[PDB]
RNA sequence: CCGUUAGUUGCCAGCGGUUCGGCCGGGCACUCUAACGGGACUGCCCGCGAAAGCGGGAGGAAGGAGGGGACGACGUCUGGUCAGCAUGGCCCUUACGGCCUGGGCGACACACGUGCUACAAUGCCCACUACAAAGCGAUGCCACCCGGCAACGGGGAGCUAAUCGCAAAAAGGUGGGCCCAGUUCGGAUUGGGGUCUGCAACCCGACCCCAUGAAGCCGGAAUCGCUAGUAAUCGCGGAUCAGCCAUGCCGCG
């Protein structure tokens, strides 16, 4: 039941993690509807290349934020053990909501 | 001076956020 | 006024009246972002470097 | 636009209200401007800076909502 | 615009009538990126000659068209060490495109308060040979065939 | 007929012929034909010849207009000249009053360019 | 009991749903006859019928989603043909050669730095 | 363009309650979303030039680079930047260092650069009636209720965010007016009157009201960008921030 999203600026670190979470329950308890890809959120920053007069010639950067979601349909008292056990993830943050 | 200090003219040059705009 | 102005941007003296920004490494006045605390310069010379997580170079 | 509430600088009342315990004199040398022309003070002369000097003026009934900083011109061209 | 001779765009024909020629004109009156606001003028004008007479607004359209398409015309071209002008015939496609832009620009000149009025008139007045779009047409030929003597370039 | 006593803008639409009076424009026409219940969608070339005067003593009483207006206009200024305030100087010196830029523009307080070169 | 069509042009979305009816063609409710009251391309949205001599035949539920108005129409001029072919597939050689079964994608150009409307560079002053 | 994966946006496309709203039960094709992938290579055929290549054509979504981004070699301009920063050398060190109040870069007989509204019937107002793409926000975004003839004020729903909101999009469609006028075209200037953020709004803020309503009738010599969803036109966001230079810039339709 309990709710978690997955937020990472890189899908590779996020999808894998999203694929990683599924292991700690879908192969520990009942089936889980796979990850739910939210529309990716961006933080679109374009900056003038030059340090002085050349106002044009700018260059663009993005701090993309890839959001994905996973919902378990039967919170199993043993699978949740397998969750916190996975203390080897990556540089990605996640939250748990009820 | 469109959008500055002490007139009344026009604000398509000064903006409005934080200016006098609703916050909380 | 290099090492003389950033120090002012700390004590917070007069009312919400002189509350401005200041880049960290570059210490530059304007063109500073509230997200990175970096001038448009003191951001690139770390962005292209890589010390800016998720800050790739855009393309679209 | 002076909304619900008008104003005038602090030490001004220090420098202008003591001028009335006996309805006192006129001479003054201060440093404020953005203040509001005080309807309760149309009977003195006020030292108002411009950039290099204080240039005053005798205050007159009609002067109310305007500011003390207008009687002291700054950009010497006119 | 030097090497390969480009590609002529091919246009979307009309819906009402069955001819590209119709659309070829409505897009021409179109201004400011306002498309439907133009077909009114045209088709409001169409729905006048239907009431004016037993003349179909299309089966007549083309006649003033062939009364606005000229034959031979001039072209400015530099030779020797100064500037003169050279005549020639007229490209048929250009002959068509030259006609339309001739036609529309005749609208706003006509003294007519509304809209389609400015359209049908220069069309109709050129259906027999007494229209502005005819004057500016022949004038070129008047400025052209008067230069028959330039028989060496010509090509 | 003899409408606005002072000026007369006959043979036009009322509400709008109103606008062409030193002090009338649009909403002035609203409350008028909404306080004196007279319908605005009319001409003057053919109306009830009594609806000519009912707008007078209404329009021509409470507030001020026409020659009875530029006084206040002329009022709130001569003082400002004789008051020595910087704003008063603006009107005089061919300059603007809502402080604009004079490195360019401000023709509306001037009128001509003068070049000089 | 029906056939579905997709139609996307100019980033517009207009779900197309053909059924074998008689004469009901509306859009999200409203009424295609009068949703689009006052148009010109309006007839052009239903073309793959009179070109197949079959307008007085089938029926169509319509859902649009956002997108540009002409892009909402020009996309409908697809999902019609972008349907039917499922169980009505012989509807091809009198369409593709004539030239309908195509998206005609013409997506906008993005604005770019150092310019204005994506391609109009500012005024140029050698002086 | 399509396939799969996955369903808190979407869906009566099939059904069951509906205050007839996607509100619900319910479901994942469709909408949409974001990860990996197939696909377009002159592949095939009818011809042409030996050759690369060309007119094609079929199939295919697209065919010959499908259309945009970012990527910018050796090198000149002894180019620009000691004022983003570091730094040689000369100098300043009872000040060429530092703090505050005020004033100034907005000053104006002028002229140029880049833009903004126009100088109007494909036109301009008023009322009614739909469609976005992207972007942003908890000590913030503001629905909504009332008050306000209006910018806005008090109360406060939801939202740390595909949910809540900014947010109403304009051109569009219908209907009435205005029937060519210096105009119900344009808003500069200016008088008076307001709310709206912050120690504080004269030079040096908006928005709104009563107006005041200037030149402007298409612009000389010249000259500018633009080869396709481009040009023009119409509108929507972001970025620095106590307020503050944001009609400029960068994005979206
Ligand atoms: Mg396609
Ligand atoms: Mg150099
Ligand atoms: Mg305007
Ligand atoms: Mg209003």
Query: In the structure, how far is the CA atom of residue F25 from the C1' atom of nucleotide H187, in angstroms?
Result: 14
Contact F66, F21 (CB under 8 A): yes
Q: Return the CATH number at E150.
A: 1.10.455.10
**Any binding-site annotation on C37?**
no
Show the DSSP H helices in chain A as ranges.
Answer: 11-23, 79-85
Give chain G's domain count: 1
Q: Return the CATH number at G66.
A: 3.30.230.10
How many residues are there in chain C? Answer: 60
Domain coordinates in residue numbering, chain F: 1-71, 72-117
Q: Does G108 touch chain E (CB under 8 A)?
A: no
* Token code pair at residue E12: 């979307």
Name chain E's partners: 3 or more CB pairs within 8 A.
G
Report the chain G residue with the minimal C-alpha distance to residue E13.
G44
For residue B15, the CA-to-ligand 4 centroid distance in Å is 19
Assign domain F72-117 to its CATH architecture: Irregular (4.10)
- Looking at CA atoms only, how far is residue G110 from chain A in angstroms? 13
The HSE-up count of residue E51 (CA atoms within 13 Å, CB side) is: 7
* Token code pair at residue A62: 């993005």
Query: In the structure, how far is the CA atom of residue G118 from the C1' atom of nucleotide H252, in angstroms?
Result: 12
- Closest nucleotide over all strands to C42 (CA to C1'): H84
CA end-to-end distance (rounded Å), chain B: 29
Best mutation target among G110, G112, G113 (most A Cβ atoms within 10 Å) is G113
* Token code pair at residue B23: 């916050």
Angle, helices E116-128 vs E36-52, to 10°: value is 50
Triad D7, D13, D18: Cα angle to 5°: 155
- Looking at CA atoms only, how far is residue C17 from chain A in angstroms? 28
Cα–Cα distance, D26 to G63 (Å, whole number)? 81
Cα–Cα distance, D34 to D41 (Å, whole number)? 16
For residue A48, the CA-to-ligand 2 centroid distance in Å is 20
Contact G39, E36 (CB under 8 A): yes
Q: Does A50 touch chain G (CB under 8 A)?
A: no
Contact A45, A63 (CB under 8 A): yes
Contact C33, C23 (CB under 8 A): no
Q: Does G41 touch chain E (CB under 8 A)?
A: yes
Cα–Cα distance, E42 to F90 (Å, whole number)? 56
**Any binding-site annotation on C11?**
no
Closest of E153, E49, E147, E66 to residue E102, by C-alpha: E66
Best mutation target among E17, E35, E36 (most G Cβ atoms within 10 Å) is E36
Scan for tokens 């079964």, then name that residue: G101
- Looking at CA atoms only, how far is residue C41 from chain A in angstroms? 7
Q: What contacts B6, CB < 8 A, 6 or more positions away? A: F99
- The distance from CA E81 to its chain's CA centroid, rounded to whole angstroms, is 34
CATH class of the domain defined by D1-78: alpha beta
* Token code pair at residue G36: 């689009």
**Any binding-site annotation on C23?**
yes
DSSP character at residue F5: S
Protein CB footprint (7 Å) on chain H nucleotides: 1-2, 5-8, 11-14, 29-36, 58-62, 66-72, 80-81, 83-86, 97-115, 121-123, 130-136, 139-142, 149, 152-153, 156, 161-162, 171-174, 177-180, 183-184, 188-214, 224-233, 238-253
Q: Which ligand is nearest to the CA of B12?
A: 3
- Closest nucleotide over all strands to E29 (CA to C1'): H122
Q: Which residues pair with G120 in a beta bridge?
A: none
Question: Per the CB < 8 Å rule, is D63 touching F85?
Answer: yes
Contact G40, G83 (CB under 8 A): no
The HSE-up count of residue A9 (CA atoms within 13 Å, CB side) is: 13
Q: Which ligand is nearest to the CA of F27?
A: 4
Q: Return the CATH number at C8.
A: 4.10.830.10
* Token code pair at residue G50: 């009179």
Q: What contacts C43, CB < 8 A, 6 or more positions away? A: A47, C33, C36, C52
Q: What contacts F25, CB < 8 A, 6 or more positions away? A: F19
Residue-by-residue DSSP string for F34-100? HHS---SS--SSSS-TTTTTTTHHHHTTSS--TTTTHHHHHHHHHHHHHTT-HHHHHHHTT--SS--
Contact B10, B16 (CB under 8 A): no
Q: Which fold has domain F1-71?
A: Helicase, Ruva Protein; domain 3 (1.10.8)
* Token code pair at residue F106: 């401000």
Question: Per the CB < 8 Å rule, is C56 touching A48?
Answer: no
* Token code pair at residue B21: 């705009």
Point out the residue among D62, D63, D70 whose CB comes nearest to the CB of F86: D70
Cα–Cα distance, G23 to G103 (Å, whole number)? 27
Set of chain C residues whose Cβ sits within 8 Å of the Cβ of A63: 54-56
Scan for tokens 């920004």, then name that residue: C21
Point out the residue among A49, A62, A91 whose CB comes nearest to the CB of C56: A62
For residue B3, the CA-to-ligand 4 centroid distance in Å is 21
Coil, helix or strand for E121?
A: helix
Contact A72, A32 (CB under 8 A): yes
Q: Where are the beta strands (DSSP E) in chain E?
A: 72-77, 84-89
**Any binding-site annotation on C26?**
yes
Domain interval for residue C30: 1-60
Coil, helix or strand for E43?
A: helix
For residue E133, the CA-to-ligand 3 centroid distance in Å is 36
Question: Per the CB < 8 Å rule, is G114 touching A58?
Answer: yes
Q: Do chains D and G touch (3 or more CB pairs under 8 A)?
A: no
Indicate the CATH number of A1-98 among 3.40.50.410, 3.30.365.10, 2.60.40.10, 3.30.70.600: 3.30.70.600
* Radius of gyration, alpha carbons of chain G: 18
> Judging by DSSP bridges, how do beta strands G59-65 and G13-19 pair with one another?
antiparallel
Contact E110, E51 (CB under 8 A): no
Coil, helix or strand for E77?
A: strand
Set of chain F residues whose Cβ sits within 8 Å of the Cβ of B1: 99-101
Distances (CA, A) of G74 to G7, G9, G12, G88, G97: 8, 7, 9, 22, 19
Set of chain F residues whose Cβ sits within 8 Å of the Cβ of D73: 86, 89
For residue G25, the CA-to-ligand 1 centroid distance in Å is 25
Domain interval for residue E34: 1-155
Closest of A22, A20, A31, A25 to residue A89, by C-alpha: A20
Scan for tokens 């009342």, then name that residue: D13
- Give Dmax over CA atoms of chain E in angstroms: 59
Contact F3, F10 (CB under 8 A): yes
Q: What are phi and psi of D17, to 5 degrees?
A: -85, -30
Q: Does B1 touch chain F (CB under 8 A)?
A: yes
Contact G26, G99 (CB under 8 A): no
- The distance from CA A50 to its chain's CA centroid, rounded to whole angstroms, is 34
Scan for tokens 């002529």, then name that residue: E8
Query: In the structure, how far is the CA atom of residue C12 from the C1' atom of nucleotide H99, in angstroms?
Result: 14
Q: What contacts A72, CB < 8 A, 6 or more positions away? A: A1, A2, A25, A29, A32, A79
Give chain E's domain count: 1
Domain coordinates in residue numbering, chain D: 1-78
Distances (CA, A) of C8 to A94, C20, C34: 39, 10, 18
For residue G111, the CA-to-ligand 3 centroid distance in Å is 25
- Compute, in degrees rounded to 10, the torsion defined by CA atoms A85, A86, A91, A94: -70
Cα–Cα distance, A50 to C45 (Å, whole number)? 12
Query: In the structure, how far is the CA atom of residue G117 from the C1' atom of nucleotide H223, in angstroms?
Result: 21
Residue-by-residue DSSP string for F88-115? HHHHHTT--SS---SSS---TTT-S---
Set of chain C residues whose Cβ sits within 8 Å of the Cβ of A59: 44, 57
């Amino acid at each position: 039941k309990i709710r978690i999203k997955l937020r990472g600026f890189d899908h590779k670190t996020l999808d894998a993690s999203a694929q990683k979470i599924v292991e700690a329950a879908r192969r520990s308890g009942a089936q889980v509807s796979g990850p739910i890809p939210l529309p990716t959120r961006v933080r679109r920053f374009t900056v003038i290349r030059g340090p002085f007069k050349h106002k044009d010639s700018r260059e663009h950067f993005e701090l993309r934020t890839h959001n994905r979601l996973v919902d378990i349909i039967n919170p199993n008292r043993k699978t949740i053990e397998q969750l916190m056990t996975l203390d080897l993830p990556t540089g990605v943050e996640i939250e748990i909501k009820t | 001076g469109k959008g500055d200090r002490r007139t009344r003219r026009g604000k398509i040059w000064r903006g409005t956020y934080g200016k006098y705009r609703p916050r909380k | 006024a290099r090492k003389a102005l950033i120090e002012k941007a700390k004590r917070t003296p007069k009312f919400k009246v002189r509350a401005y920004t200041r880049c960290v490494r570059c210490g530059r006045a304007r063109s500073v972002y509230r997200f990175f605390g970096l001038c448009r310069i003191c951001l690139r010379e770390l962005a292209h470097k890589g010390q800016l997580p998720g800050v790739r170079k855009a393309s679209w | 636009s002076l909304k619900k509430g008008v104003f005038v600088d602090d030490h001004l009342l220090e420098k202008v209200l003591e001028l009335n315990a006996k309805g006192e004199k006129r001479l003054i040398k201060t440093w404020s401007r953005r203040s509001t022309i005080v309807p309760e003070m149309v009977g003195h002369t006020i030292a108002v800076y411009n950039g290099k000097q204080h240039v005053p003026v005798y205050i007159t009934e009609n002067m109310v909502g305007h500011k003390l900083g207008e009687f002291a011109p700054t950009r010497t061209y006119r | 615009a030097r090497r390969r001779r480009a590609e002529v765009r091919q246009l979307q024909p009309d819906l009402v009538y069955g001819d590209v020629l119709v659309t070829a004109f409505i897009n021409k009156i179109m201004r400011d990126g306002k498309k439907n606001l133009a077909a009114r003028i045209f088709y409001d004008a169409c729905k006048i000659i239907q009431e004016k007479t037993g003349q179909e607004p299309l089966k007549v359209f083309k006649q003033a068209v062939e009364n606005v398409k000229p034959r031979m015309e001039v072209r400015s071209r530099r030779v020797g060490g100064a500037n003169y002008q050279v005549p020639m015939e007229v490209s048929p496609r250009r002959q068509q495109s030259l006609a339309l832009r001739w036609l529309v620009q005749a609208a706003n000149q006509r003294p007519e308060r509304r809209a389609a009025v400015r359209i049908a008139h220069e069309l109709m007045d050129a259906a027999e040979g007494k229209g502005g779009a005819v004057k500016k047409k022949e004038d070129v030929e008047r400025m052209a065939e008067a230069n028959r003597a330039y028989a060496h370039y010509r090509w | 007929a003899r409408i606005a006593g002072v000026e007369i803008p006959r043979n036009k639409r009322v509400d709008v012929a109103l606008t062409y009076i030193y002090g009338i424009g649009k909403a002035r026409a609203k409350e008028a034909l909404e306080k004196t219940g007279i319908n605005p969608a009319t001409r003057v070339k053919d109306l009830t010849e009594a609806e000519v005067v009912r707008l007078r003593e209404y329009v021509e009483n409470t507030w001020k207009l026409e020659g009875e207006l530029r006084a206040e206009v002329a009022a709130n200024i001569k003082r400002l000249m004789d008051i020595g305030c910087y704003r008063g100087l603006r009107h005089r010196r061919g300059l603007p009053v809502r402080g604009q830029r004079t490195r360019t523009n401000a023709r509306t307080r001037k009128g001509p360019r003068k070049t000089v070169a | 009991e029906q056939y579905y069509g997709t139609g996307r042009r100019k980033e517009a979305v207009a779900r197309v749903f053909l059924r074998p009816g008689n004469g009901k063609v509306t859009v999200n409710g409203q009424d295609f006859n009068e949703y689009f009251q006052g148009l010109v391309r309006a007839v052009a949205a239903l073309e793959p019928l009179r070109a197949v001599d079959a307008l007085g035949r089938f029926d169509a539920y319509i859902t649009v989603r956002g997108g540009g108005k002409s892009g909402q129409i020009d996309a409908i001029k697809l999902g019609i043909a972008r349907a039917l072919v499922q169980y009505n597939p012989d509807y091809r050689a009198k369409l593709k050669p004539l030239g309908f079964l195509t998206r005609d994608a013409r997506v906008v150009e993005r604005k770019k730095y150092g310019k204005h409307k994506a391609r109009r560079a500012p005024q140029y002053s050698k002086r």
